[PDB]
Amino acid sequence: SEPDEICRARMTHKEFNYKSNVCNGCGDQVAACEAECFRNDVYTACHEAQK
């Protein structure tokens, strides 16, 4: 049970905006999209299925 602040510091400001932008598109799984810092099947699937 640790914070995901490291994930935000690891990426750039623009990155957080891009990832988050797509996250809101995946659907109602936003929480899950950021759950693993954009590192999950939920996002990997949506993002790949996002034109």
Which amino acid belongs to residue 46?
C
**Structure solved via:** NMR
CB atoms within 10 A of CB 6: 10
Which domains are seen in the chain, by residue range?
1-51 (1.10.2010.20)
- Distance from C-alpha of 44 to C-alpha of 12, rounded to nearest angstrom: 19
- Distance from C-alpha of 31 to C-alpha of 46, rounded to nearest angstrom: 13
Contact 32, 40 (CB under 8 A): yes
- Distance from C-alpha of 44 to C-alpha of 33, rounded to nearest angstrom: 9
- Distance from C-alpha of 6 to C-alpha of 41, rounded to nearest angstrom: 20
Phi, psi dihedrals of residue 20, rounded to the nearest 5°: -60, -40
